[PDB]
A = this chain, B = another copy of it.
Amino acid sequence: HHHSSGENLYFQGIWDRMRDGFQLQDAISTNPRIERQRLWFLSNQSFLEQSSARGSLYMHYVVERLEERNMPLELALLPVIESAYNPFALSRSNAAGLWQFIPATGQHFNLRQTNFYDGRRDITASTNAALTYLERLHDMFNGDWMLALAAYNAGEGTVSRAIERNEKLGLPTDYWNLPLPQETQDYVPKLLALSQIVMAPDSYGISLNPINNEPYFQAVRVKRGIDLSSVAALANLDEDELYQLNPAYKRRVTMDGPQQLLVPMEKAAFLTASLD
């Protein structure tokens, strides 16, 4: 119960703002599995740097959504481990977008999947769905964020079955003792290790890319037959940047999508007035 309710506008950078809402640091065990993931980040330092530079487009939005819901701000780092904040990322299980929704879970959250539009890549739709899913999982596991994260990665069924197996054997049923697939064994310590580094990067000899505490994009209502090319030309925008903000459109063809477009803040007023 650290509710900010809109005073976090005063923070200079996004990292400080994120740190303000961290909720999982108090209870971090010193399980060696966390140390193991911490070393991975230190020895692959370009991973966080590249994720941060891409993340600069999206992180402000993610942070504000988490704050509004009073959810742990460590979850603003979840796309780092899921997708390196690359919304075009696609796993071999066909997990898609920043939040790595598989097709069936995406479908459950009404993240539409056509040949030209994939709602799982849509920044705003996918983020709100992911936070809703995470909240639901947390509720299903009696408020335990470790089990919720495990279930996000492995599925609620897998985690529940692991719990019941341990109950029958007379083993403890906390996340750390569950016999989960290796990916899920690594998943939670990975997030915890990364959050420790983000909390105190100096202490690991790391420097984070400065990211300002300001919105990068604004949603603009548009018409049906307006191409990204046309919007780019109209506002003298970099078409690559527009695509990175609107990655749901495969082949950059604006078909099959909602009548909303994310545009850079500095051109938002012009495009609002021009298109709407």
Chain A residues near B (Cβ < 8 Å): 1-10, 65, 68-70, 108-112, 119, 122, 124-125, 128-129, 131-132, 135-136, 139, 143, 214-215, 221, 257-260, 268-270, 272-273
Contacts and interface: CB of A to CB of B under 8 A. Distances in A.
Given A139-B143, A258-B6, A1 B124 contact: no
A119 B260 contact: no
A87 to B, nearest CB: 15
How often does this chain occur in the complex, in copies? 2
B132 A68 contact: yes
Nearest to A273: B269
Given A69-B132, A69-B135, 7 more contacts: A4-B110, A5-B260, A6-B112, A69-B69, A69-B131, A139-B143, A215-B221
A68 B3 CA distance: 19
11 contacts: A1-B110, A5-B110, A5-B258, A6-B112, A6-B258, A6-B260, A68-B128, A69-B69, A69-B132, A135-B135, A270-B273
A132 B70 contact: yes
A125 B6 contact: yes
A8 B108 contact: no
Contacts of A6: 112, 119, 122, 124-125, 257-258, 260
